[PDB]
Design an enzyme around this catalytic site. Structure first.
Site, mmCIF file in Angstrom:
data_model
loop_
_atom_site.group_PDB
_atom_site.id
_atom_site.type_symbol
_atom_site.label_atom_id
_atom_site.label_comp_id
_atom_site.label_asym_id
_atom_site.label_seq_id
_atom_site.Cartn_x
_atom_site.Cartn_y
_atom_site.Cartn_z
ATOM 1 N N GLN D 55 0.802 -1.213 0.000
ATOM 2 C CA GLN D 55 0.000 0.000 0.000
ATOM 3 C C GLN D 55 0.836 1.264 0.000
ATOM 4 O OE1 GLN D 55 -2.834 -0.193 3.254
ATOM 5 N NE2 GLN D 55 -3.600 -2.209 2.609
ATOM 6 N N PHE D 124 6.620 8.534 6.597
ATOM 7 C CA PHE D 124 6.422 7.156 6.985
ATOM 8 C C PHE D 124 7.140 6.941 8.335
ATOM 9 C CE2 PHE D 124 3.945 4.434 4.523
ATOM 10 C CZ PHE D 124 4.388 3.118 4.484
ATOM 11 N N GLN D 245 8.446 -8.994 11.900
ATOM 12 C CA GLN D 245 7.791 -7.708 12.010
ATOM 13 C C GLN D 245 6.306 -7.864 12.267
ATOM 14 O OE1 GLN D 245 7.420 -4.097 8.840
ATOM 15 N NE2 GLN D 245 9.116 -4.044 10.288
ATOM 16 N N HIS D 247 3.311 -5.445 12.180
ATOM 17 C CA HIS D 247 2.923 -4.141 11.706
ATOM 18 C C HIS D 247 1.953 -3.615 12.746
ATOM 19 C CE1 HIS D 247 1.244 -0.916 9.243
ATOM 20 N NE2 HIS D 247 2.200 -1.136 8.359
ATOM 21 N N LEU D 257 -4.239 -5.240 6.436
ATOM 22 C CA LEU D 257 -3.339 -4.131 6.659
ATOM 23 C C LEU D 257 -4.032 -2.796 6.429
ATOM 24 C CD1 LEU D 257 -0.410 -3.054 7.134
ATOM 25 C CD2 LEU D 257 -0.405 -2.744 4.657
ATOM 26 N N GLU D 260 0.667 2.255 7.125
ATOM 27 C CA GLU D 260 1.403 3.217 7.909
ATOM 28 C C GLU D 260 1.347 4.620 7.304
ATOM 29 O OE1 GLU D 260 6.107 3.038 8.838
ATOM 30 O OE2 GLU D 260 4.645 2.031 10.150
ATOM 31 N N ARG D 291 8.479 0.449 13.569
ATOM 32 C CA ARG D 291 7.362 -0.483 13.725
ATOM 33 C C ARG D 291 7.475 -1.366 14.977
ATOM 34 N NH1 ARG D 291 5.438 -0.044 7.464
ATOM 35 N NH2 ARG D 291 6.213 -2.162 7.080
ATOM 36 N N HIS D 358 3.498 -9.550 9.799
ATOM 37 C CA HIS D 358 3.438 -8.754 8.560
ATOM 38 C C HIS D 358 4.581 -8.979 7.584
ATOM 39 C CE1 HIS D 358 2.652 -5.322 5.943
ATOM 40 N NE2 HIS D 358 3.856 -4.844 6.206
ATOM 41 N N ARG D 403 12.680 -4.048 9.856
ATOM 42 C CA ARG D 403 12.553 -3.518 8.540
ATOM 43 C C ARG D 403 11.854 -2.167 8.621
ATOM 44 N NH1 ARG D 403 7.289 -4.220 5.060
ATOM 45 N NH2 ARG D 403 7.640 -2.163 4.133
HETATM 46 C C1 LIG Z 1 -0.390 -6.097 3.211
HETATM 47 C C2 LIG Z 1 1.050 -5.735 2.919
HETATM 48 C C3 LIG Z 1 1.391 -4.435 2.542
HETATM 49 C C4 LIG Z 1 2.701 -4.105 2.298
HETATM 50 N N1 LIG Z 1 2.992 -2.852 1.910
HETATM 51 C C5 LIG Z 1 4.251 -2.492 1.654
HETATM 52 C C6 LIG Z 1 4.602 -1.127 1.233
HETATM 53 O O1 LIG Z 1 3.686 -0.289 1.107
HETATM 54 N N2 LIG Z 1 5.884 -0.838 0.993
HETATM 55 C C7 LIG Z 1 6.850 -1.750 1.112
HETATM 56 O O2 LIG Z 1 8.051 -1.465 0.886
HETATM 57 N N3 LIG Z 1 6.590 -3.012 1.491
HETATM 58 C C8 LIG Z 1 5.351 -3.434 1.768
HETATM 59 N N4 LIG Z 1 5.094 -4.749 2.174
HETATM 60 C C9 LIG Z 1 6.209 -5.677 2.212
HETATM 61 C C10 LIG Z 1 6.422 -6.067 0.718
HETATM 62 O O3 LIG Z 1 5.266 -5.856 -0.111
HETATM 63 C C11 LIG Z 1 6.785 -7.507 0.443
HETATM 64 O O4 LIG Z 1 7.761 -7.911 1.391
HETATM 65 C C12 LIG Z 1 7.388 -7.649 -0.961
HETATM 66 O O5 LIG Z 1 6.524 -7.097 -1.955
HETATM 67 C C13 LIG Z 1 7.597 -9.122 -1.300
HETATM 68 O O6 LIG Z 1 8.006 -9.235 -2.647
HETATM 69 P P1 LIG Z 1 8.559 -10.642 -3.198
HETATM 70 O O7 LIG Z 1 8.673 -10.521 -4.700
HETATM 71 O O8 LIG Z 1 9.789 -11.033 -2.408
HETATM 72 O O9 LIG Z 1 7.428 -11.736 -2.787
HETATM 73 P P2 LIG Z 1 5.881 -11.848 -3.179
HETATM 74 O O10 LIG Z 1 5.360 -10.602 -3.867
HETATM 75 O O11 LIG Z 1 5.188 -12.371 -1.912
HETATM 76 O O12 LIG Z 1 5.885 -12.997 -4.315
HETATM 77 C C14 LIG Z 1 6.121 -14.356 -4.004
HETATM 78 C C15 LIG Z 1 6.186 -15.084 -5.331
HETATM 79 O O13 LIG Z 1 6.843 -16.352 -5.180
HETATM 80 C C16 LIG Z 1 6.021 -17.392 -5.712
HETATM 81 N N5 LIG Z 1 6.108 -18.653 -4.936
HETATM 82 C C17 LIG Z 1 6.061 -18.826 -3.604
HETATM 83 N N6 LIG Z 1 6.150 -20.152 -3.292
HETATM 84 C C18 LIG Z 1 6.259 -20.831 -4.446
HETATM 85 C C19 LIG Z 1 6.371 -22.236 -4.877
HETATM 86 N N7 LIG Z 1 6.408 -23.242 -3.988
HETATM 87 N N8 LIG Z 1 6.460 -22.500 -6.194
HETATM 88 C C20 LIG Z 1 6.419 -21.539 -7.128
HETATM 89 N N9 LIG Z 1 6.310 -20.242 -6.803
HETATM 90 C C21 LIG Z 1 6.230 -19.839 -5.516
HETATM 91 C C22 LIG Z 1 4.614 -16.835 -5.669
HETATM 92 O O14 LIG Z 1 3.771 -17.419 -6.667
HETATM 93 C C23 LIG Z 1 4.801 -15.348 -5.892
HETATM 94 O O15 LIG Z 1 4.758 -15.011 -7.290
HETATM 95 C C24 LIG Z 1 3.769 -5.121 2.426
HETATM 96 C C25 LIG Z 1 3.439 -6.395 2.812
HETATM 97 C C26 LIG Z 1 2.130 -6.725 3.037
HETATM 98 C C27 LIG Z 1 1.888 -8.105 3.531
#
Ligand SMILES: Cc1cc2nc3c(=O)[nH]c(=O)nc-3n(C[C@H](O)[C@H](O)[C@H](O)COP(=O)(O)OP(=O)(O)OC[C@H]3O[C@@H](n4cnc5c(N)ncnc54)[C@H](O)[C@@H]3O)c2cc1C
Ligand SMILES: C/C=C/CC/C=C/CC/C=C/CCCCCCC(=O)OC[C@H](COP(=O)(O)OCCN)OC(=O)CCCCCCC/C=C/C/C=C/CCC
Ligand code: HEM
Ligand SMILES: CC(C)(C)c1ccc(CNC(=O)c2ccccc2C(F)(F)F)cc1
Ligand code: SF4
Ligand code: F3S
Ligand code: FES
Lengths: 250, 129, 153, 616
Positions: D55, D124, D245, D247, D257, D260, D291, D358, D403
């Site tokens: 968000q 933030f 973390q 949140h 969520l 923030e 946080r 979170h 974080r």
């Molecule tokens: C509600 C919420 C709001 C947030 N808002 C913010 C924000 O405003 N700003 C900020 O900086 N951070 C924010 N965060 C933290 C941040 O969004 C995430 O930590 C970050 O986007 C994660 O990115 P990622 O690509 O590592 O994982 P994700 O976006 O979680 O992607 C995981 C990927 O891995 C794949 N995967 C998982 N397991 C397997 C499997 N066994 N086989 C094949 N594929 C698999 C999934 O299909 C998916 O495509 C937020 C988190 C949440 C929960």
């Protein structure tokens, strides 16, 4: 105690000669969350783990859980269970999609059509990628409000009877509103080429102003409007304004 | 066991590879524009036909209805005459039958206007009942 | 001739047929709404008027029967006037509605009044005026005819 | 493969990426641009990934709102980490932020705008100007209340331009390992039940977090720690898993969520006395403290009887004092969410909130280049050849013990990009795609078969629920030695109950009973390791707070001047990374510890930042 009945579409592609069925499940509303997804999860967990549906986010942002509930395309996760226990709620997959299993449709044509609009920023003059922000005025980026919020759930397209009959040639509301999203972006230089990809009799012009798309959209967006806008640009009743000029001091 | 076979890539629409050598198809925009202008132009025609009758109005109706209906049923035929459900040749045949529809519509109207009472008087005669 | 995505989409439909997957139901399960029902009425009224013009124009030509002996035949059945005037209403409603809603659909094409409130108001309005006009066109002349029958000179 | 026969299908790729969230997609874009044949394996359509739920925004010192410097963002990141973060990685993150965010805008991300037409930025939690001496920072760039959604859809759309091949709804089962080298991945195709072995020169794990280890989280159902589990089953130790973390503001009912950013824009927390209590717990930063501090504050208020609602068990987030135009312009998403999930109109009523699990700063350990590493005291860091990690599944470590808000979307893009850069540079067109060793993936298939036909008396859903409730009770906001030790016992017993697993769906096509059971196994590895790490760490640092060890335990007592002190040796203090090494069959965990990296990548560009006492 308040026992709500759901009638849920079922289909098992591994049984030889399998046909789709309707299966009633009873659920205690006092021992279940308020949303239809909660009931689906409770049923899967406590009665029938073979019940299969897509889901991920809990707040209607992912788009995974689109299905037809009480006759309307919506997202299970933000659709309140109807607390009238004398009526049953019917749950079906997104209409006129090929079903893989139970409430899981094959989504790959929807995705392929999205790919075909080339959903990325296009510039005539090559840009040094990390170097600077492109200019865009408040008024110009706000044209994207109503457009960028789309979560690609396909409720709108699976509500459209014209898409039901001609999905192979009609791009449908979801993809057309995104195509418009890239067309009215003041930073994007390919408006004329984006239009020409859907100049034919089917791509955009098979919208018959049925209006189910705008009616059913769980994010309260308006694909119908965006298609009207595409029609205007395609018929040359309207043009894309030029970008506002980037200030000297920018 | 893992005594296995060599896979191919899944089906995936490549929007750049598909764009190689793609010469745009002719623009349906101008046809769509005229279809709607024509329908708008008919708006005054319908009340005009309520107030003014005779053989010349009968003729205006026959021609305007025929054109409008031509474009109309052509759109209907293209909605439901789907190769996926009819096969290629039957789909083609219902496309042709749309032109046969238009042709027969006009001929039967011209007949009706020329050897029977005509459209406007036909309405009078039912309304008098 | 097809865009590449249209070609891709045909090959997709054939893959899904080959896989023998069912198609999720649609018309038999979708909630009837003022959106797709009015659209449907627009198409039905359009096509019914067309069909009537074709069957009428060609039919009378191919048959010995002409329209004057057709009208005289049904008067001969002497059926109650309220039912005759209902037939007239039914004949008039499609013309009224389809014309009115046609104007509405052209607006939709130009991106006018596509917000849900306007969609619903316009629908109700178009169904209402159409009914009001069809009513008038049937009732008014019947009114005159009752005056001619029972008032002096 | 004991009872059934499985159709196994082999692929050959230059690189395989597991994950299609922010990190996986950014990596894929860079690799496809560099001509590498790239496979993206994701268990859901990319755009359903949890990134899409983000968000509040993404940090970069663009200076749209006031002058700024990337070094100020560096500082806040280090302090944020509570000096458990690796400063070479945090340096890399913050140095590249302006460029990374500008790329995203250049890709078409529709950032909100200022009157000058620049990217709008908000305030933030835990951020400042002039190395903590200045005022509150404004470098959190955003697309209103929906920055994650908008970033992910932008990245996904752009990934279509770069001819990566997508294997969508393929569930990854294991890394394919050959003598300590990763040569690919093995996955189940949900659509047709076929099993796929991807041979690859490199593999990037970008699988997200494991929030679903707990009973209440903000995270997607799909956050099951599959990547960290894959790494564990490959013989790789995980890092800093005890650092969870919470949140400050998940909706009380359901865990949704509330950004923030709502505080960033001027919202604040209220207790049952109508007191803006963060003024007491954090007189300087107030509701925009870090946080860990805000979440602890809220939890104390609840304990000491100033909790709100019928059960006095949560807090109010007040926004209704803000103008309606600001709420709609800046916070439309949570405005709708608060209305759907709490019946609250934010122009009029406060949102009921509570601290909620979170984000996972722990994960697969890497060096600053995002290459996965194994560590021993004698040999130091050794890279696992073939294997990279980025996003929330990694521990670079850019977040250390806590974080900072809006650093994670940044993290994912920056290090996802770094993976493509580092792979282009170190991988040559000479190296050939490796041949799989005989029997490769056969154990993953055997586990699949056994879970698929599992016969026992404890259904996966009950076992998941006890895991989650157990974690909630014993590894919460405030932890203690006896509660943790009891938690370890219950959790190592639950690990034993896995042998009694019951499943019902016997199908191979789209079997979510099967996939959710695999995810439970995966979650147990993460949870068990998380809590034993938490049990042993006898200190209070960032998100990890021990009631029986309330102090942060460093090499020096940084509350007093350094001149005169003698340094405590490694084995005595706790300013060091936890490494948990689990045996996936028995579940047995051993603990090792690895030093924090204090040096920056270049002392000429930026000074390292010595620890001080952490206060907001
Ligand atoms: C509600 C919420 C709001 C947030 N808002 C913010 C924000 O405003 N700003 C900020 O900086 N951070 C924010 N965060 C933290 C941040 O969004 C995430 O930590 C970050 O986007 C994660 O990115 P990622 O690509 O590592 O994982 P994700 O976006 O979680 O992607 C995981 C990927 O891995 C794949 N995967 C998982 N397991 C397997 C499997 N066994 N086989 C094949 N594929 C698999 C999934 O299909 C998916 O495509 C937020 C988190 C949440 C929960
Ligand atoms: C299924 C039904 C099939 C129908 C046939 C399809 C063909 C349709 C084409 C007909 C075009 C209009 C005909 C008008 C007409 O016949 O005269 C009046 C007559 C009465 O004779 P009569 O007894 O001679 O009538 C009195 C003579 N003065 O018939 C009527 O009364 C019909 C009423 C027409 C309603 C007008 C629509 C309203 C439009 C509004 C537009 C809005 C803004 C502009
Ligand atoms: C008087 C004003 C009229 C207007 C403004 C009008 C307008 C329209 C419009 C806009 C459509 C396109 C619908 C779509 O594509 O979704 C349409 C379709 C049609 N109209 Fe009319 N029309 C009028 C009168 C008539 C009349 C008198 C007939 C008599 C037969 C007729 C027959 C049709 C038919 C058959 C279609 C078929 C296409 C469809 O349903 O999509 N129309 N009309
Ligand atoms: C008459 C009735 C049985 C109520 C009915 C209503 C609505 C439908 C679905 N609508 C349609 O099929 C329809 C209707 C109007 C214009 C275009 C279409 C299209 F081909 F594009 F879908 C089908 C059938
Ligand atoms: S428009 Fe509304 S409905 Fe159609 S996809 Fe985007 S969100 Fe789902
Ligand atoms: S429902 Fe279908 S026909 Fe046009 S207005 Fe919406 S797309
Ligand atoms: S689970 Fe994400 S929209 Fe419902």
């Amino acid at each position: 105690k308040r026992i709500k009945t759901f009638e849920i579409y079922r289909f098992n592609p591994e049984e030889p000669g399998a046909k789709p069925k309707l299966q009633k499940f009873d659920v205690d509303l006092d021992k279940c969350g308020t949303m239809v997804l909660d009931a689906l999860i409770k049923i899967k967990n406590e009665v029938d783990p073979t019940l299969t549906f897509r889901r991920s986010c809990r707040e209607g942002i992912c788009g995974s859980c689109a299905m037809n509930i009480a006759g309307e395309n919506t997202l299970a996760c933000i659709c309140n269970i109807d607390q009238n226990t004398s009526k049953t709620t019917k749950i079906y997959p997104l209409p006129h999609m090929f079903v893989i299993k139970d409430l899981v449709p094959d989504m790959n044509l929807f995705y392929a059509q999205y790919a075909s609009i080339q959903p990325w920023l296009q510039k005539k003059t090559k840009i040094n990628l990390g170097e600077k922000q492109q200019y865009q005025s408040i008024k110009e980026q706000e044209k994207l409000d109503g457009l960028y919020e789309c979560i690609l759930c396909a409720c709108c397209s699976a509500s459209c009877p014209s898409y039901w009959w001609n999905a192979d040639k009609y791009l449908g509301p979801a993809v057309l509103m995104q195509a418009y999203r890239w067309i009215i972006d003041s930073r994007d230089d390919s408006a004329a080429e984006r239009l020409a990809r859907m100049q034919d009799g089917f791509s955009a012009f098979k919208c018959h102003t049925i209006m189910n798309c705008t009616k059913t959209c769980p994010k309260h967006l308006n694909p119908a409007r965006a298609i009207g806008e595409i029609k205007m640009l395609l018929t040359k009743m309207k043009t894309k304004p030029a970008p506002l000029p980037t200030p000297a001091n920018f | 066991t893992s005594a296995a076979v060599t896979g191919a890539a899944p089906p995936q629409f490549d929007p750049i590879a598909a764009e190689k050598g793609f010469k745009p198809l002719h623009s349906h925009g101008t046809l769509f524009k005229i279809e709607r202008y024509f329908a708008a132009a008919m708006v005054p025609l319908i009340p005009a036909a309520y107030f003014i009758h005779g053989r010349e109005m009968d003729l205006c109706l026959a021609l305007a209805l025929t054109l409008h209906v031509h474009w109309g049923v052509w759109g209907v035929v293209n909605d439901y005459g789907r190769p996926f459900v009819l096969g290629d040749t039957l789909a083609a045949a219902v496309r042709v039958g749309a032109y046969i529809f238009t042709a027969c519509l006009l001929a039967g109207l011209l007949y009706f206007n020329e050897h029977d009472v005509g459209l406007t008087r036909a309405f009078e005669m039912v309304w008098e009942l | 001739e097809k865009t590449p995505i249209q070609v891709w989409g045909w090959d997709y439909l054939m893959r899904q047929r080959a896989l023998k997957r069912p198609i999720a139901p649609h018309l038999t399960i979708y909630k009837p709404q003022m959106t797709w029902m009015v659209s449907g009425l627009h198409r039905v009224t359009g096509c019914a008027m067309a069909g009537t013009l074709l069957i009428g124009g060609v039919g009378f030509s191919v048959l010995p029967l002409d329209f004057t002996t057709f009208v005289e035949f049904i008067r001969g059945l002497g059926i109650p006037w309220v039912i005759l005037d209902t037939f007239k209403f039914i004949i008039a409603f499609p013309i009224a509605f389809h014309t009115l809603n046609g104007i509405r659909f052209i607006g939709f094409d130009m991106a006018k009044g596509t917000d849900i409130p306007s969609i619903y108001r316009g629908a109700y309005l178009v169904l209402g005026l159409a009914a009001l006009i069809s009513l008038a066109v049937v009732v008014y002349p019947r009114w005159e005819r009752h005056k001619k029958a029972t008032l002096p000179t | 493969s004991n009872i059934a026969q499985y159709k196994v299908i082999d692929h050959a790729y230059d690189v395989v990426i597991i994950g299609a969230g922010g990190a996986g997609l950014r990596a894929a874009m860079g690799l496809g641009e560099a001509g590498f044949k790239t496979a993206v394996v994701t268990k859901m359509f990319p755009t359903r990934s949890h990134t899409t739920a983000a968000q509040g925004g993404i940090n970069a010192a663009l200076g749209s709102m006031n002058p700024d410097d990337w070094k100020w963002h560096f500082y806040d990141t280090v302090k944020g980490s509570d000096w458990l973060g690796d400063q070479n990685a945090m340096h890399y993150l913050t140095r590249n932020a302006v460029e990374a965010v500008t790329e995203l805008e250049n890709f078409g991300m529709p950032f909100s705008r200022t009157p000058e037409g620049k990217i709008y930025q908000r305030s933030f939690g835990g951020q400042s100007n002039n190395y903590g001496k200045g005022g509150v920072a404004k470098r959190t760039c955003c697309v209103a209340d929906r920055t994650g959604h908008s970033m992910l859809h932008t990245l996904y759309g752009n990934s279509l331009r770069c001819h990566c091949t997508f294997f969508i709804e393929y569930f990854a089962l294991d890394l394919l390992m050959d003598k300590g080298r990763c040569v690919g991945v093995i996955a189940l195709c949900l659509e047709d039940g076929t099993i796929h072995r991807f041979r690859s020169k490199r593999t990037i794990v970008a699988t997200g977090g494991y929030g679903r280890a707990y009973f209440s989280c903000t995270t997607a159902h799909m956050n099951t720690g599959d990547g960290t589990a894959l790494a564990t089953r490959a013989g790789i130790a995980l890092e800093d898993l005890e650092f969870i973390q919470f949140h400050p503001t998940g909706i009380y009912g359901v865990g949704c969520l509330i950004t923030e950013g709502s505080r960033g824009e001027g919202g604040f927390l209220v207790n049952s006395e109508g007191e803006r209590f963060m003024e007491r717990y954090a007189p300087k930063a107030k509701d925009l403290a870090s946080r860990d501090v805000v979440s602890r504050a809220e939890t104390i208020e609840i304990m000491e009887g100033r909790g709100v609602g019928p059960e006095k068990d949560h807090i109010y987030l007040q926004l209704h004092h803000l103008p309606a135009e600001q709420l709609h312009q800046r916070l439309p998403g949570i405005s709708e969410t608060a209305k759907i999930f709490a019946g609250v109109d934010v122009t009029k009523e406060p949102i009921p909130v509570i601290p909620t699990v979170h984000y996972n700063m722990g994960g697969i350990p890497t060096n600053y280049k995002a290459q996965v590493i194994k560590y021993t005291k004698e040999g130091g860091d050794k890279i696992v050849p073939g294997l990279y990690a980025c996003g929330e599944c990694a521990c670079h470590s850019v977040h250390g013990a806590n974080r900072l808000g809006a650093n994670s979307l940044l993290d994912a893009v920056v290090f996802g990009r770094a993976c493509s850069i580092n792979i282009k540079e170190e991988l040559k067109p000479d190296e050939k795609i490796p041949e799989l060793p005989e029997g490769a993936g056969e154990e993953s298939i055997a586990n699949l078969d056994a879970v698929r036909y599992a016969n026992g008396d404890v259904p996966t859903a009950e076992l998941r629920l006890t895991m989650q409730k157990t974690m909630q009770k014993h590894a919460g906001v405030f932890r203690r030695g006896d509660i943790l030790a009891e938690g370890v016992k219950k959790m190592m017993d639950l690990f034993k109950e896995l042998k009694r697993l019951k499943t019902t769906d016997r199908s191979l096509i789209w079997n979510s009973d099967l996939t959710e059971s695999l995810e439970l196994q995966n979650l147990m590895l993460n949870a068990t390791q998380t809590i034993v790490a938490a049990e042993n760490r006898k200190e209070s640092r960032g998100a990890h707070a021990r009631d029986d060890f309330p102090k942060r335990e460093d090499e020096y007592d940084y509350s007093k001047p350094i001149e005169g002190q003698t340094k405590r040796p490694f084995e005595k203090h706790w300013r060091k990374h936890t490494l948990t090494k689990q045996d996936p069959r028995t579940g047995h965990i051993t603990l090792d510890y690895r030093p924090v990296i204090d040096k920056t990548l270049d002392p000429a560009e930026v000074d390292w930042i010595p620890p001080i006492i952490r206060s907001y």
